[PDB]
């Protein structure tokens, strides 16, 4: 056999890379972490640095508070027994308020109030993290594609835990925090709405999720196939097309009669991925608010 470029044959290392400066406040940047030779066989060895800053601190603190709020509930459900805690870890659940409490913030602590608190922390964690993806791009003079794409995941997340529950009139609609319980909730959501397989937005979401794996397998294999001509150096292939990008394009043109460019494939990529949760969010948002039963709806389209 010859080289397949899945794992490197030789690692090289030099001075830690502290990164571009541009408008970045360098005082908010950590130092480098350690180097991971094991990681270095596949990807980069260098860990860190990371940017912190005020938003990131707020985001991480909030996120930890969410995590700890759930975890303390689990400790409580375990009777503070570490053995029970480990045994039943996936079975524990922090559940939203019962339907009778509606949207009321006056739900009892042990009956949805703590769920509301955990949810408040998650909400600020995620939205401050979003702010971050925007500001980190801005400080570097970059486009906002990351923050734009993240917004599509946030849309599904928002629909599940916030928008749909408000439109339905109770927090009881929202998703509980537990490993198995979130699965049971997903199963049940479909059963109660007449089987999501009849929701045309769930079928789209699936086409795009499968499509994402199809397209990343294609793109990833293509780039690796032309890495012998520097194909992974995609930004320079955009600025100054090379034989890597040409052979990439022609493999596909000859295979299926059309092809992308080095820049344009990345637009196919970003849209394929964001459409998963864009269509999904719409599909979930319409369930119960507009369509009680997807089977029934499909028999009518009305």
């Amino acid at each position: 056999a010859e080289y397949q470029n899945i794992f490197s044959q030789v690692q090289v290392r030099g001075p830690a890379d502290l990164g571009m400066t541009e408008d970045v406040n360098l005082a908010n940047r950590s130092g480098v972490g350690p180097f991971s030779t094991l990681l270095g066989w596949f990807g980069n060895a260098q860990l860190g640095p990371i940017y912190l800053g005020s938003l990131g601190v707020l985001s991480l603190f909030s996120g930890l508070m969410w995590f700890f709020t759930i975890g303390i509930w689990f400790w409580y459900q375990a009777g503070w027994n570490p053995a029970v805690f480990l045994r039943d870890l996936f079975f524990f659940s922090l559940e939203p308020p019962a339907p009778e409490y509606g949207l009321s913030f006056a739900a009892p602590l042990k009956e949805g109030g703590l769920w509301l608190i955990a949810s408040f922390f998650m909400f600020v964690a995620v939205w401050s993290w979003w702010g971050r993806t925007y500001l980190r791009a801005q400080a570097l003079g970059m486009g906002k594609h990351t923050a734009w794409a993240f917004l599509s995941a946030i849309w599904l997340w928002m629909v599940l835990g916030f928008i749909r529950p408000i439109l339905m009139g109770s927090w009881s609609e929202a998703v509980p925090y537990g490993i198995f319980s979130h699965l049971d909730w997903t199963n049940n959501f479909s059963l109660v709405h007449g089987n999501l397989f009849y929701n045309p937005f769930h079928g789209l979401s699936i086409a795009f999720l499968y499509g994402s794996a199809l397209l990343f397998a294609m793109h990833g294999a293509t780039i690796l196939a032309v890495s012998r001509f520097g194909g992974e150096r995609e930004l320079e292939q955009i600025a100054d097309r090379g034989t890597a990008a040409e052979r990439a394009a022609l493999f596909w043109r000859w295979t299926m009669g059309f092809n992308a460019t080095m820049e344009g494939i990345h637009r196919w990529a970003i849209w394929m991925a964001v459409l998963v949760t864009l269509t999904g969010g719409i599909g979930i948002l319409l369930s119960g608010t507009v369509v009680d039963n997807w089977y029934v709806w499909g028999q009518n389209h009305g």
């Binding site: 571009m20 980069n44 375990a78 029970v84 906002k144 397989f197 990343f216 294609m218 052979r247």
Partner: protein, 281 residues
């Protein structure tokens, strides 16, 4: 018919079968022996589907469905109208898929690129084949395969899943899903990072790969790097499919009950099985 840069690559050679017999193009499409094989398998397959639709009494693409032989046929042949068409169409599909991959191989050879793409496509084929061939064979009947219809294949997913309770509890299915979700996240992030560099703030210069590394390190404290991300996209999507195939091949062959029960093995470990409290006590 040709891209502006294309003519220098349209040279002879690279074929696996037939020398120069089929070494030519139709418009953008390369032919090759396996191009002709794809056409033969696909045309036959589609004709048989059309025949099946006639015997079913419908032309509606929403309704046409080609079912595998009833379980009573086991792993033998069935009358054309009672599962035999499904069996021939399955051979045509396999022949068509494999031909398509082998054509890709001929294309790789002419362009002098690596074989990564047909290698990856082969995971898709092996997953298809897990469902229609390996799993049915291991279970002892063609009738355990899915049917070829737009809506009926979905009936089959639903019915098969619910045979084992909530199929969410299949642990290999969990891993597959995590790979699918993670693949989509990485795809979105890769497309976005490249584009954010190539299309910066108004009036600014294109950013460099160094700015891509910097943005992601600033964000999460790591960057896998340009080669790493393309390796990763491939590992995630192929791992997804590997675990999909794994999760089905074990279902109805070494595991037969509600998947939810499988998790009892952890709950019942002797050092905590009988401690009161929590969910399972």
């Amino acid at each position: 018919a040709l891209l502006s840069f294309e003519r220098k690559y349209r040279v002879p050679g690279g074929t696996l079968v037939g020398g120069n017999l089929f070494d030519f193009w139709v418009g953008p499409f390369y032919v090759g022996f396996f191009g002709v094989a794809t056409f033969f398998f696909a045309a036959l397959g589609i004709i048989l589907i059309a025949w099946s639709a006639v015997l079913q009494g419908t032309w509606n693409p929403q309704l046409i469905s080609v079912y595998p032989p009833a379980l009573e046929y086991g792993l033998g042949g069935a009358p054309l109208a009672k599962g035999g068409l499904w069996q021939i169409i399955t051979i045509c599909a396999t022949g068509a898929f494999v031909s398509w991959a082998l054509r890709e191989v001929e294309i790789c050879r002419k362009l002098g690129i690596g074989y990564h793409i047909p290698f990856a496509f082969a995971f898709a084929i092996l997953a298809y084949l897990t469902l229609v061939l390996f799993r049915p064979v291991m279970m002892g009947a063609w009738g355990y395969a899915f049917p070829y219809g737009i809506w009926t294949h979905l009936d089959w997913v639903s019915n098969t899943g619910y045979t084992y309770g909530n199929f969410h509890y299949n642990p290999a299915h969990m891993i597959a899903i995590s790979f699918f979700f993670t693949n989509a996240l990485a795809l979105a992030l890769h497309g976005a990072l490249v584009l954010s560099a190539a299309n910066p703030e108004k009036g600014k210069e294109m950013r460099t790969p160094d700015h891509e590394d910097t943005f992601f390190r600033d964000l999460v404290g790591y960057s896998i790097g340009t080669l790493g991300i393309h390796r990763l996209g491939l590992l995630l999507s192929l791992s997804a499919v590997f675990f999909s195939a794994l999760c089905m091949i074990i279902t109805g062959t070494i595991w037969f009950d509600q998947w939810v029960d499988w998790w009892q093995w952890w709950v019942k470990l002797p050092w905590w099985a009988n401690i009161p409290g929590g969910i399972n006590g």
